[PDB]
Design a protein around this nucleic acid. Structure first.
Ligand SMILES: NCCC[C@H](N)C(=O)O
Ligand SMILES: [K+]
Ligand SMILES: [K+]
Ligand SMILES: [K+]
Ligand SMILES: [K+]
Ligand SMILES: [K+]
Ligand SMILES: [K+]
Ligand SMILES: [K+]
Ligand SMILES: [K+]
Ligand SMILES: [K+]
Ligand SMILES: [K+]
Ligand SMILES: [K+]
Ligand SMILES: [K+]
Ligand SMILES: [K+]
Ligand SMILES: [K+]
Ligand SMILES: [K+]
Ligand SMILES: [K+]
Ligand SMILES: [K+]
Ligand SMILES: [K+]
Ligand SMILES: [K+]
Ligand SMILES: [K+]
Ligand SMILES: [K+]
Ligand SMILES: [K+]
Ligand SMILES: [K+]
Ligand SMILES: [K+]
Ligand SMILES: [K+]
Ligand SMILES: [K+]
Ligand SMILES: [K+]
Ligand SMILES: [K+]
Ligand SMILES: [K+]
Ligand SMILES: [K+]
Ligand SMILES: [K+]
Ligand SMILES: [K+]
Ligand SMILES: [Mg+2]
Ligand SMILES: [Mg+2]
Ligand SMILES: [Mg+2]
Ligand SMILES: [Mg+2]
Ligand SMILES: [Mg+2]
Ligand SMILES: [Mg+2]
Ligand SMILES: [Mg+2]
Ligand SMILES: [Mg+2]
Ligand SMILES: [Mg+2]
Ligand SMILES: [Mg+2]
Ligand SMILES: [Mg+2]
Ligand SMILES: [Mg+2]
Ligand SMILES: [Mg+2]
Ligand SMILES: [Mg+2]
Ligand SMILES: [Mg+2]
Ligand SMILES: [Mg+2]
Ligand SMILES: [Mg+2]
Ligand SMILES: [Mg+2]
Ligand SMILES: [Mg+2]
Ligand SMILES: [Mg+2]
Ligand SMILES: [Mg+2]
Ligand SMILES: [Mg+2]
Ligand SMILES: [Mg+2]
Ligand SMILES: [Mg+2]
Ligand SMILES: [Mg+2]
Ligand SMILES: [Mg+2]
Ligand SMILES: [Mg+2]
Ligand SMILES: [Mg+2]
Ligand SMILES: [Mg+2]
Ligand SMILES: [Mg+2]
Ligand SMILES: [Mg+2]
Ligand SMILES: [Mg+2]
Ligand SMILES: [Mg+2]
Ligand SMILES: [Mg+2]
Ligand SMILES: [Mg+2]
Ligand SMILES: [Mg+2]
Ligand SMILES: [Mg+2]
Ligand SMILES: [Mg+2]
Ligand SMILES: [Mg+2]
Ligand SMILES: [Mg+2]
Ligand SMILES: [Mg+2]
Ligand SMILES: [Mg+2]
Ligand SMILES: [Mg+2]
Ligand SMILES: [Mg+2]
Ligand SMILES: [Mg+2]
Ligand SMILES: [Mg+2]
Ligand SMILES: [Mg+2]
Ligand SMILES: [Mg+2]
Ligand SMILES: [Mg+2]
Ligand SMILES: [Mg+2]
Ligand SMILES: [Mg+2]
Ligand SMILES: [Mg+2]
Ligand SMILES: [Mg+2]
Ligand SMILES: [Mg+2]
Ligand SMILES: [Mg+2]
Ligand SMILES: [Mg+2]
Ligand SMILES: [Mg+2]
Ligand SMILES: [Mg+2]
Ligand SMILES: [Mg+2]
Ligand SMILES: [Mg+2]
Ligand SMILES: [Mg+2]
Ligand SMILES: [Mg+2]
Ligand SMILES: [Mg+2]
Ligand SMILES: [Mg+2]
Ligand SMILES: [Mg+2]
Ligand SMILES: [Mg+2]
Ligand SMILES: [Mg+2]
Ligand SMILES: [Mg+2]
Ligand SMILES: [Mg+2]
Ligand SMILES: [Mg+2]
Ligand SMILES: [Mg+2]
Ligand SMILES: [Mg+2]
Ligand SMILES: [Mg+2]
Ligand SMILES: [Mg+2]
Ligand SMILES: [Mg+2]
Ligand SMILES: [Mg+2]
Ligand SMILES: [Mg+2]
Ligand SMILES: [Mg+2]
Ligand SMILES: [Mg+2]
Ligand SMILES: [Mg+2]
Ligand SMILES: [Mg+2]
Ligand SMILES: [Mg+2]
Ligand SMILES: [Mg+2]
Ligand SMILES: [Mg+2]
Ligand SMILES: [Mg+2]
Ligand SMILES: [Mg+2]
Ligand SMILES: [Mg+2]
Lengths: 271, 46, 34
RNA sequence: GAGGACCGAACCGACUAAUGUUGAAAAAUUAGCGGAUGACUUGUGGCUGGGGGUGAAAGGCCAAUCAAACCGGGAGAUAG
RNA sequence: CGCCGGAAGACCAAGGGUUCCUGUCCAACGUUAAUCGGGGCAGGGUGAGUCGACCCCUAAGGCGAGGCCGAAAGGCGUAGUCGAUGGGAAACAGGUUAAUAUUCCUGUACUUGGUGUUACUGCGAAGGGGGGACGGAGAAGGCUAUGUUGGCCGGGCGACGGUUGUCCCGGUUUAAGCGUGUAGGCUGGUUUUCCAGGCAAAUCCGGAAAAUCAAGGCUGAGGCGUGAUGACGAGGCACUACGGUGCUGAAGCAACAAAUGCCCUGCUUCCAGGAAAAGCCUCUAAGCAUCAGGUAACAUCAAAUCGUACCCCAAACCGACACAGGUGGUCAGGUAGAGAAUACCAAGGCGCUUGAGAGAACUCGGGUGAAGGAACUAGGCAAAAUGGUGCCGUAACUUCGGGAGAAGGCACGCUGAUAUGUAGGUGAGGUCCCUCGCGGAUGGAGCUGAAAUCAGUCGAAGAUACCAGCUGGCUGCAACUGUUUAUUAAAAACACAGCACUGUGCAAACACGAAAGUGGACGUAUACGGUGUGACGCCUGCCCGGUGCCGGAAGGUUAAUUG
RNA sequence: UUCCUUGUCGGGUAAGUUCCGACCUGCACGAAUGGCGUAAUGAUGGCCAGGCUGUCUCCACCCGAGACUCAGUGAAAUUG
RNA sequence: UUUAAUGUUUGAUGUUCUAACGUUGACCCGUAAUCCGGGUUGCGGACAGUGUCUGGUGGGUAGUUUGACUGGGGCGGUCUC
RNA sequence: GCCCGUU
RNA sequence: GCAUCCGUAGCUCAGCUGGAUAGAGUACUCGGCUCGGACCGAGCGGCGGAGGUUCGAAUCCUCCCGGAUGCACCA
């Protein structure tokens, strides 16, 4: 449910928030929490290597199961929880032996639903099976690229992957970008879409809301001096050159993919 | 107003003290130079 | 920098005293022969 | 009982005027002024090192020094 | 006599290092003199099982055996080991020195270990689980610190009219610990059986099932009792080197008001979703098994070492100075007040290390001003003016929130009555009930106490001082709150939410690195980077010749190589 | 953003190179190095009005700190 | 000039293969260890990647150049016969 | 295929 | 004020054949189709001025006039 705020102040006029009342109002499950301290976009040399990262709210890391290899044992969904580390919501499940795990919460999944992993599970949203046992045409998410490695594709809120063909030991996937990719058929996938599909409907409204997420302000290169950026300089507003990065590489159109060992898996690039 | 020297004994010894000099090769050459000049205080210490 | 002054050992940069363009009350309207 | 909400001390800042300009002070004082639950402010410790850092970008700041810091050396550079 | 009193008082951290106290000296130092001093010289002064460090445990981060990488020097990093600004056992009141005191003395306490004796007993970890253990905002209730008034006790009867009273001044203080368990907060309890989980095991945690009980447990300020037949105590008496010293000592209660402190690491609510590890509790493995070990009582022993003076919004720290500067934390009295604003005061601390005269111009900081009222000037610069609470009233425009405190106006002191003090707040006695106590009902003494109306009355003036918005009309730019040239520029510049293009399929693009590796990200196209534009509303037209980028492969030209 | 230019007309003033409204002859506006609007906001730029005033006509007097005299201490820039 | 036949051959493209090489897939051990190494297996596979040589691109970065006369420099003009 | 007008 | 490029038929523009010869569209005139357009067939209509070289100039020189473009900076 998206709600518009009322314009009681100029920083509240444009705020549109996504409020989900079925989330757990309470503390998260403590044995699956870890420390996660912030970086500032700096590496082990101490240098800024990614700009515009800094500050934000303190966050604890939730150990989410991306593998889903606890085969054969059923699990009941206890509740849905907020995760500050990702765009999607997470679900706390309880297996029959008494193990608790966090999974990504799919679309339409409530508290009390029954999920099951493994090779002989049923085709319903929330179950994780290898893709040689999934019908062609299904909508899946949390897709593995290597068998046993863990899910890596279609993890963000509202995303999914369609299974277009199965030919031999490989399946062809239509990725969310529009790219056709071959992945081998022994890799796992979870049925359904990722939940929280109106995450892209929210409006931050004010500059401080971006600072709460650890995003620092972007300075335009044309607003600098020539010593700082290629776009810098001018007596007034001058541009005069082709648009480039801060390191002089042409942006706005120039391709940067250079990976000769993975090109055989890509059937069609995005358009 | 606030001037540039704000003293702190822990930050003094961690930055320019004796074990800080002895840790690197370049800091051990600072000590060799000062011993060769014959200086009465090698490092900034207690 | 003036590092071994014997008459004024306390100060190293003294050009804010006698140079007219570096004093705090220098005004650029004094430089009107342009 | 929400808010980069309102008035206003602490706290943080520096728009105007006068004084001062061998000053009480190598940038302040007095009288007004702005923010004042936030993109706030502050203590202690830590990390980034010179064609490099850091920069809500003024060539700003990096120990009263910055269109390339300081110290030592090449070095008695060269100077129609 | 004057000044400060949310400090210009008091206590510390940081930093300094003898500046502390006593005697002595006045050359130099002190912006003057100096008998004085943070100056010279000499002597003295810092007492801890409980305060702090050290110690045990970790954060960011550092170093890092092996290892990986690099002409050399070195770089990164595993196991580890360090690293507080965070977590971890325990003491209070009074007295005392010229100078130290939660350290000494008096009184009364507490904690953790070692050893020994007795009684009983499954003890054991580098492993498992629990706990420690955590955000912002808001609201209310119960309390205390503290204050005020009464009562009580001691003293007083007033330099000038009055002052035996509804009069004046002073005092009315008491801790940790131990005992009791209240306002409040959280949670169902117990037994039995079983199980793909917790790297193996487990009686512990997690899960399942069944039976049974209507209660149980955990947490917790304050109060009360004890500590305390003590200590302190206004004063009085006795000596004195007139600085001080010795002895004795009355009352020591109640009501009301009340925190930003405590209950509260709570409760409610929101999204931006809020450290770690040990001490602590518990489970077992290898193992040992009349051992060792564990639990309780008692006795005994130990608790080392280092810091402790003094200054600390400053004449002792950072500023060359005894320099209108800068500097983190804690304590928070009275009257008026919404208040930590402001005015005057208390405790306490000071009068700022040149003075004495005179009363010219001119300069600085202020006060007042006939008649006029922006005529001044680049420009109302600067001054002057407005200023509080309650109530009435308030336009265009608008994104429906605003505009708005729009504009403008009226009331405001004191005394009496309503009402010997009202509405409201607090609530003793008495009585009743039980659960017999820190309980409930009734009851209203005493205390506290607005706001309004009516009548009267004084002044030129009642928000009387300090304190405390000038208002309105038209228009450019930028949506807005923010940010910036430390020291001549705060803005129309930068940023911003929003929009678009483009790159990127994860060993991602990209960035820092000769490399290893790291950031991006423990993220995965509703994500991440780059570029331009800059809320919102209505929109964003035509040109691909030039330069760039993307796609194409026929033909032409074309490197090393071959010869 | 307009050189010519204080363009021309209208409003405001006794009198207006600025301001506000319009005209179009745009030296040399123009659509995301955005176009045109826009409530609220601004120590932002321009203009007008009321109130208020030593800003001024045009200054006068008073209260303090210096300046002046006495005692003590005792500089500086500059200089054939 | 023109073609086919036999014998012999290298280059091109294509298809599989595994054994070099890759693995920031899984499991086991050194081992109390998300490093590293070894082992087992899976997936890639003579590709990728790296060294030497070579063509292109390359203000990302560096070193420099950018004349003189002149009724001041610049602009214009001039520079030899 | 095109093929206006008429004070 | 300096520099550069242009003045050709009523109008808008080519021609520099490196000096020996002036064209195109439109306009206009005549005839036809039907009253007028449109349409069809024919035609007419001249190198900015003033000198100089030259056997000879629209063309090449020198000056003048007119029209455009650019520049006029540091104080
Ligand atoms: N870094 C500060 C040094 C100050 C020195 N006395 C000077 O005059 O520069
Ligand atoms: K920007
Ligand atoms: K600029
Ligand atoms: K509020
Ligand atoms: K901080
Ligand atoms: K440098
Ligand atoms: K320095
Ligand atoms: K003397
Ligand atoms: K002095
Ligand atoms: K600490
Ligand atoms: K735990
Ligand atoms: K259990
Ligand atoms: K344990
Ligand atoms: K002490
Ligand atoms: K005099
Ligand atoms: K006000
Ligand atoms: K706009
Ligand atoms: K400003
Ligand atoms: K700026
Ligand atoms: K994007
Ligand atoms: K990470
Ligand atoms: K084009
Ligand atoms: K093009
Ligand atoms: K094209
Ligand atoms: K213009
Ligand atoms: K008129
Ligand atoms: K007029
Ligand atoms: K402003
Ligand atoms: K304005
Ligand atoms: K392999
Ligand atoms: K290759
Ligand atoms: K000349
Ligand atoms: K001349
Ligand atoms: Mg960015
Ligand atoms: Mg942006
Ligand atoms: Mg700039
Ligand atoms: Mg550049
Ligand atoms: Mg421009
Ligand atoms: Mg000095
Ligand atoms: Mg605010
Ligand atoms: Mg600033
Ligand atoms: Mg100021
Ligand atoms: Mg001020
Ligand atoms: Mg303020
Ligand atoms: Mg204001
Ligand atoms: Mg305010
Ligand atoms: Mg904030
Ligand atoms: Mg710090
Ligand atoms: Mg500039
Ligand atoms: Mg210096
Ligand atoms: Mg500096
Ligand atoms: Mg340089
Ligand atoms: Mg040399
Ligand atoms: Mg020399
Ligand atoms: Mg006073
Ligand atoms: Mg001394
Ligand atoms: Mg003393
Ligand atoms: Mg003296
Ligand atoms: Mg003294
Ligand atoms: Mg002394
Ligand atoms: Mg001495
Ligand atoms: Mg300790
Ligand atoms: Mg290391
Ligand atoms: Mg070497
Ligand atoms: Mg340690
Ligand atoms: Mg003392
Ligand atoms: Mg544990
Ligand atoms: Mg109390
Ligand atoms: Mg008596
Ligand atoms: Mg009496
Ligand atoms: Mg009398
Ligand atoms: Mg640990
Ligand atoms: Mg000091
Ligand atoms: Mg000082
Ligand atoms: Mg100094
Ligand atoms: Mg003094
Ligand atoms: Mg001072
Ligand atoms: Mg302060
Ligand atoms: Mg005050
Ligand atoms: Mg006092
Ligand atoms: Mg006077
Ligand atoms: Mg007057
Ligand atoms: Mg009068
Ligand atoms: Mg008057
Ligand atoms: Mg005027
Ligand atoms: Mg005038
Ligand atoms: Mg003013
Ligand atoms: Mg109106
Ligand atoms: Mg309103
Ligand atoms: Mg309204
Ligand atoms: Mg009003
Ligand atoms: Mg009256
Ligand atoms: Mg204008
Ligand atoms: Mg703005
Ligand atoms: Mg602002
Ligand atoms: Mg400046
Ligand atoms: Mg400045
Ligand atoms: Mg500056
Ligand atoms: Mg200024
Ligand atoms: Mg300024
Ligand atoms: Mg980006
Ligand atoms: Mg812009
Ligand atoms: Mg466009
Ligand atoms: Mg191409
Ligand atoms: Mg006019
Ligand atoms: Mg106009
Ligand atoms: Mg423009
Ligand atoms: Mg333009
Ligand atoms: Mg554009
Ligand atoms: Mg506009
Ligand atoms: Mg004198
Ligand atoms: Mg004298
Ligand atoms: Mg192969
Ligand atoms: Mg260059
Ligand atoms: Mg050179
Ligand atoms: Mg020259
Ligand atoms: Mg010239
Ligand atoms: Mg017609
Ligand atoms: Mg007709
Ligand atoms: Mg002629």
């Amino acid at each position: 449910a998206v709600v518009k705020c009322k314009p009681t102040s100029p920083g509240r006029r444009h705020v549109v928030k996504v409020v989900n009342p079925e989330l757990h109002k309470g503390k998260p499950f403590a044995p699956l929490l870890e420390k996660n301290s912030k970086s500032g976009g700096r590496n082990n040399n101490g240098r800024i290597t990614t700009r515009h990262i800094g500050g934000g709210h303190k966050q604890a890391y939730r150990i989410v199961d991306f593998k889903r290899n606890k085969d054969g044992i059923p699990a009941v969904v206890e509740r849905l929880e907020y995760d500050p580390n990702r765009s999607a919501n997470i679900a706390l499940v309880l297996y029959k032996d008494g193990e608790r795990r966090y999974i990504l919460a799919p679309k339409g999944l409530k508290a009390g639903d029954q999920i099951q992993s493994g090779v002989d599970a049923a085709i319903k949203p929330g179950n994780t099976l290898p893709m040689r046992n999934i019908p062609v045409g299904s909508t899946v998410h949390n897709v593995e690229m290597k068998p046993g490695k863990g899910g890596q594709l279609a993890r963000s809120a509202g995303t999914y992957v369609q299974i277009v063909a199965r030919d031999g030991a490989y399946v062809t996937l239509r990725l969310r970008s529009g790219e056709m990719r071959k992945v081998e058929a022994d890799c796992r996938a979870t049925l359904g879409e990722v939940g929280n599909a109106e995450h892209m409907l929210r409006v931050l409204g004010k500059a401080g809301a971006a600072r709460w997420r650890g995003v620092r302000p972007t300075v335009r290169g044309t607003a600098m001096n020539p010593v700082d950026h290629p776009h810098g300089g001018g007596e007034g507003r001058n541009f005069g050159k082709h648009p480039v990065t801060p390191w002089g590489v042409q942006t706005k159109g120039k391709k940067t993919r250079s990976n000769k060992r993975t090109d055989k898996f890509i059937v069609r690039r995005r358009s | 107003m606030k001037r540039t020297f704000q003293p702190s004994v822990l930050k003094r010894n961690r930055s320019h003290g004796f074990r800080a000099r002895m840790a690197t090769k370049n800091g051990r050459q600072v000590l060799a130079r000062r011993r060769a000049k014959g200086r009465a205080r090698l490092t900034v210490s207690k | 920098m003036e590092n071994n002054s014997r008459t004024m050992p306390h100060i190293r940069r003294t050009t804010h005293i006698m140079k007219f363009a570096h004093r705090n009350s220098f005004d650029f309207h004094f430089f009107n022969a342009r």
